[PDB]
């Protein structure tokens, strides 16, 4: 669901590294991710001969850039996006700040330890 | 012999360069106000350079010479930002000296980030009483051999009072 | 979706695997020093120091002794926005980073042995920074002083050892509302809709 | 929002102080008229109370999130040389100023051996002293009624306090030595001769 998000003659064969690290690497809670990219990367480089004309508060570089294509084609496509990482960590400005570029509402909820299904 | 030969300070001379004219000059010279109460004067670039990024006549820098009392607060002031330290060059042959110290802050004046941080230099001019007389109009003369501030001298006067320390070889 | 590692905290439990095959997992770490240290500075005047000794001193402090199973002390816990507070309010540095930076990790402290090694290593930084009773009288000013300049400001410590004092002066010497409320071992979610609905006129 | 014991609550009471200063809303929606209207949105809505810590007997522990987003003040008990002495000396002083030096040295030291989980009245602090201290204003002129009231008046809630004086029953590798009521009442006989 992640190949077919986004379409290009180049970026079909790239898509592959960004599509497939983007759900275990980054899912990983453990230190076992470091040694899985290596054969996705040199697999996933130059490859395609193309045709397709290549058409369709603080601010960091990862969560402005690295964390913008990945969530809004996530958040875009129809997925659950789930944050992981520390307590306060900057996981709820991402949205609120990423929210800015298009045209969406963000909506953050204080939920409890009585938040069942009913 | 020593009376009237004593060793006042002639003169402070704050000096801040900055490669360009525009806001962070005059925020440059509103440092050098503040802190002198008076009003400071500007030095324009003597030719152009291009690797520095200026023109001849373009405003580059200011300063300010502040005499008497005032001099030796700013002195000791910003001396202390030193730790009291300076060098046996610093010192020159004519017996006056200088150091420069970068964040002007470090010498009460507070922050305010619309101002920014720049640079505490300045020299010190040294002399005896008779300096007149290679300064006045009529009869100019030159200041006898054995009444010329000396580096020696100077550095003496230096390590006593302030009681600071001289440093290197 | 928002939440922690359940291998970090003890005591968490794990996910579904149901939801965890439509559940896209996005990675986001905390921000660097460098990208909050020109915030947290103002401008050149307030030097590097301390935007340096509250980035270094707080990213050693809060990893030193975090809020997990791992740490000692569990009420001791910062963040990236906690900075931000105690920098933008100290625009003049010198000597108000100790008393302003000791009641933002130092004042999180059950006793003084625990205030006394994060307060004297956290104002010992500020003295290697930069090339150049106390305690009580050095927090009362600050507290009553940025107490009446808003801000959620909380009292924790024993009931009547001084608690009263800052809310009772700072409630008679501002003019407020006046919602006192005695909670209970009965006060839940619905203590603060039904307390807070007829009280002020309704009649 | 004045808060006594808001640290003295169960599950429920953060989540909506916690979402009151941090999303800005009243938790998940409102009771009172909540449906399918308007939401609830704090844009004017701040907190000002105080309360107790996590460690004490009865209070539960709050959240990383929601003590780190507020400035906790570091002010603990006071000390027992001058703010429980001077603490106790109100009110004390029109009767024996003398007899308010041993009262604050035993108070200090069995409250901090007598911890709270036992039973819900082991717990010392402020109380003990202030109404053990406000309690024995009115006495005998002698030192006999002095001594026994100030020294009988701190055990109705030392000796009480405990859940039994003194336990026999057959263990294996359990040996009772001492009481529990020997080591807090053996304190008196020197603490009343030493300053009286």
């Known amino acids: 669901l992640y190949v077919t998000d986004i379409i290009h003659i180049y970026g079909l064969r790239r898509s592959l590294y960004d599509g497939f690290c983007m759900s275990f690497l980054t899912l990983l809670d453990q230190k076992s991710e470091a040694i899985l990219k290596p054969v996705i990367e040199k697999f996933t480089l130059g490859r395609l001969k193309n045709v397709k004309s290549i058409m369709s508060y603080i601010i960091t570089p990862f969560v402005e850039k690295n964390m913008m294509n990945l969530v809004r084609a996530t958040s875009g496509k129809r997925f659950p996006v789930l944050i992981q990482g520390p307590t306060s960590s900057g996981k709820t400005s991402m949205i609120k700040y990423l929210a800015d570029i298009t045209g969406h509402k963000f909506v953050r909820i204080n939920n409890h330890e009585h938040t069942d299904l009913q | 012999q020593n009376p009237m030969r004593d060793l006042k300070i002639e003169k402070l001379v704050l000096n801040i360069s900055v490669g360009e004219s525009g806001d962070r000059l005059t925020r440059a010279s509103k440092v050098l106000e503040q802190l002198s109460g008076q009003t400071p004067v500007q030095s324009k670039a003597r030719y152009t350079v291009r690797t520095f990024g200026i023109r001849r006549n373009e405003k580059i820098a200011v300063h300010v010479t502040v005499r008497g009392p005032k001099a030796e607060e700013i002195l000791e002031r910003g001396l202390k930002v030193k730790e009291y330290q300076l060098r046996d060059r610093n010192f020159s042959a004519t017996g006056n000296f200088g150091f420069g110290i970068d964040e002007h802050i470090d010498l009460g004046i507070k922050y305010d980030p619309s101002i920014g941080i720049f640079g505490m230099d300045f020299y010190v001019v040294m002399n005896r009483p008779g300096a007149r007389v290679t300064r006045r109009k009529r009869c100019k003369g030159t200041v006898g051999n054995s009444h010329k501030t000396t580096k020696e001298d100077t550095v003496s006067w230096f390590k006593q009072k302030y009681d600071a320390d001289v440093l290197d070889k | ?203 | ?196």
């Open chain 3, 1 to 203: 979706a928002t939440q922690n590692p359940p291998g970090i905290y003890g005591g968490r439990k794990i996910l579904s695997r149901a939801f965890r095959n439509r559940f896209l997992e996005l990675h986001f770490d905390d921000i660097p020093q460098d990208e909050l240290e020109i915030i947290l500075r103002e401008r050149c005047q307030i030097a590097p120091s301390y935007a340096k000794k509250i980035v270094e001193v707080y990213r050693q402090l809060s990893i030193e002794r975090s809020a997990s199973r791992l740490f000692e002390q569990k009420n001791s816990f910062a963040t990236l926005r906690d900075l931000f507070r105690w920098a933008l309010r100290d625009a003049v540095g010198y000597e108000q980073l100790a008393a302003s930076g000791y009641m933002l990790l130092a004042e999180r402290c059950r006793t003084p042995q625990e205030k006394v090694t994060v307060k004297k290593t956290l104002e010992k930084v500020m003295k290697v920074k930069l090339d150049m009773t106390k305690g009580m009288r050095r927090l009362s000013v600050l507290v009553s002083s940025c107490l009446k300049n808003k801000e959620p400001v909380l009292l924790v410590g024993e009931t009547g050892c001084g608690k009263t004092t800052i809310c009772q002066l700072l409630a008679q010497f501002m003019g407020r509302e006046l919602i006192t409320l005695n909670a209970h071992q009965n006060t839940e979610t619905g203590d603060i809709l039904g307390a807070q609905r007829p009280v002020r006129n309704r009649s």
């Open chain 4, 1 to 196: 929002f004045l808060l006594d014991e808001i640290s003295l609550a169960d599950d429920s009471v953060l989540e909506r102080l916690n979402s009151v200063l941090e999303p800005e809303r009243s938790l998940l929606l409102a009771e009172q008229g909540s449906s399918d209207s308007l939401v609830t949105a704090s844009e004017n809505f701040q907190f000002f109370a105080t309360m107790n810590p996590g460690g004490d007997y009865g209070k539960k522990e709050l959240s990383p999130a929601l003590r780190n987003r507020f400035t906790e003040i570091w002010v603990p008990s006071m000390e027992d040389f001058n703010d429980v002495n001077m603490i106790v000396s109100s009110r004390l002083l029109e009767d024996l100023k003398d007899l308010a030096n041993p009262i604050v040295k035993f108070s200090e030291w069995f409250g901090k051996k007598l911890g709270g989980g036992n039973a819900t009245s082991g717990v010392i602090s402020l109380r003990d002293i202030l109404a053990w201290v406000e309690f024995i204003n009115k006495v005998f002129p002698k030192i006999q009624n002095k001594s026994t009231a100030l020294i009988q008046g701190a055990s109705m809630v030392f000796i009480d306090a405990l859940g039994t004086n003194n336990t026999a029953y057959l263990a294996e590798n359990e040996n009772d030595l001492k009481s529990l009521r020997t080591e807090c009442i053996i304190q008196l006989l020197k603490l009343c001769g030493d300053d009286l």
